[PDB]
């Protein structure tokens, strides 16, 4: 048996548009040193340092430093812990969280608008998000379970249907917790 | 503020003798995620869609492939593609690395792979 682990201090980052930067902690929970390799992916941003040695059990800080202004944009911050017939396999965890670029022009927060998802079925269960925020669904059931996905702002997302017509969902709030359960008849 | 802790435990399977197919090479337990099966991607250098490739260390470049599966049979992406989408179990999920075979047909000796496990939280 061999254990691997990479912990990021937060499960998502809310990045205020044009902000100088934010700091996020990373921890090597493994008992061997690793190289921590950090990269930002599309769904312009600098991660310092992008590669550094993090010894066994050690934690360090990353700096993330910087788009439409009418809605959020989504990026992914990936943090990877790299080792610097017989079968030998080595693993490397690549821990990715949502980097949510949020204009100050935006009124409210996702939880204020989680209830406003409207739904229809064609083809596929379709959600409609009229809010300027990513609606990061963490729980979704239709007719009593659907692998959830975020609904992009001012946009739609089509889930595969898995004749009952209830849809229940929870978004993940800005703090990484599951929000209230909302339910509508479709 | 909830942290994103991702953990992985790898447990070796039975010794392999010259190969049988569907052999359990080893078991993986992925934990800490908040998360569906298509949110997990196991990648390696060979980059063979759906399979991890193990290569000999004798310079002869013998290779066999493996699939990664869990339970109804499910699968994370392997090199960007699913083999066999669901919500992962709470807390942790077991994945099993199972031999397929060798397309090239194997010397006894040591075989290796370096595998990246990408978890896209949420």
Curated annotation (Swiss-Prot), chain A:
One Gene Ontology CC term in the entry? outer membrane-bounded periplasmic space
Q: Which UniProt keywords apply?
A: Chaperone, Disulfide bond, Immunoglobulin domain, Periplasm, Plasmid, Signal
Pfam families reported in the protein's UniProt record: PapD_C (PF02753), PapD_N (PF00345)
Can you tell me which residues the record assigns to a coiled coil? Answer: none
Cystine pairs? 78-96
Q: What is one Gene Ontology biological process annotated in the Swiss-Prot or TrEMBL record?
A: chaperone-mediated protein folding
- List all membrane-crossing ranges: none
Give compartment(s).
Periplasm
Q: State the InterPro entries in the record.
A: Ig-like_fold, PapD-like_sf, Periplasmic_pilus_chap, Pili_assmbl_chap_C_dom_sf, Pili_assmbl_chaperone_bac, Pili_assmbl_chaperone_C, Pili_assmbl_chaperone_CS, Pili_assmbl_chaperone_N
Is Cell inner membrane found in the keyword set? no
Annotated GO MF terms? protein folding chaperone
The domain of life is Bacteria
User: What job does the chain carry out?
Assistant: Has a stimulatory role for the envelope antigen F1 secretion. It seems to interact with the subunit polypeptide and to prevent it from digestion by a protease.
User: What family does the database annotate?
Assistant: Belongs to the periplasmic pilus chaperone family.
Q: Output this protein's name.
A: Chaperone protein caf1M
Organism of derivation: Yersinia pestis
The beginning of the lineage is: Bacteria, Pseudomonadati, Pseudomonadota, Gammaproteobacteria, Enterobacterales
Gene name of this polypeptide: caf1M
UniProtKB/Swiss-Prot annotation, chain B:
Could you confirm whether the keyword Secreted appears in this record? yes
Compartments (UniProt record): Secreted, Capsule
Example of a GO biological process term: cell adhesion
The entry's keywords: Capsule, Plasmid, Secreted, Signal
GO CC terms: capsule; extracellular region; pilus
Q: What is its main location?
A: secreted
- Secreted as a keyword of this entry, yes or no, is yes
Q: Where is this region: Contains potential antigenic determinants that may stimulate T-cells?
A: 59-103
What is the name listed in the Swiss-Prot or TrEMBL entry for this protein? F1 capsule antigen
Q: Which gene encodes it?
A: caf1
Identify the segment of the full-length protein shown. Answer: 35 to 170 of 170
């Amino acid at each position: 048996s061999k254990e691997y682990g990479v912990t990021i201090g937060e499960s998502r980052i809310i990045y205020p548009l044009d902000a100088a930067g934010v700091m996020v902690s990373v921890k090597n929970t493994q008992d061997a040193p690793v190289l921590i390799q950090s990269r930002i992916y599309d769904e312009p941003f600098v991660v310092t340092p992008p590669l550094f040695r993090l010894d066994a059990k050690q934690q360090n800080s990353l700096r993330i430093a910087q788009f439409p202004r009418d809605k959020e944009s989504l990026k992914w911050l990936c943090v990877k812990g790299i080792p610097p017939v017989g079968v030998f396999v080595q693993f490397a965890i690549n821990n990715c969280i949502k980097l949510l670029v949020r204009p100050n022009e935006l009124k409210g927060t996702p939880i204020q608008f989680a209830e406003n998802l409207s739904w229809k079925v064609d083809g596929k269960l379709i959600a409609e998000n009229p809010s300027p925020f990513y609606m990061n669904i963490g729980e979704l059931t239709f007719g009593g379970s659907i692998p959830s996905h975020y609904i992009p702002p001012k946009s739609t997302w089509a889930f595969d249907l898995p004749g009952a017509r209830n849809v229940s969902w929870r978004i993940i709030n800005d703090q990484g917790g599951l929000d209230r359960l909302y339910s509508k008849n479709v | 503020v909830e942290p994103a802790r991702i953990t992985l435990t790898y447990k070796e399977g039975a010794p392999i003798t010259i190969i049988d197919t569907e052999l359990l090479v080893g078991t993986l337990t992925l934990g800490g995620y908040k998360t569906t099966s298509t949110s997990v991607n196991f990648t390696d250098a060979a980059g063979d869609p759906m399979y991890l490739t193990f290569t000999s260390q004798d310079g002869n470049n013998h290779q066999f492939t493996t699939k990664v599966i869990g339970k109804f049979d499910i699968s994370p992406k392997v090199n960007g593609e699913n083999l066999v989408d669901v919500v992962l179990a709470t807390g942790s999920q077991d994945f099993f690395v199972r031999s397929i075979g060798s397309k090239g047909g194997l010397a006894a000796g040591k075989y290796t792979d370096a595998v990246t496990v990408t978890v896209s939280n949420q």
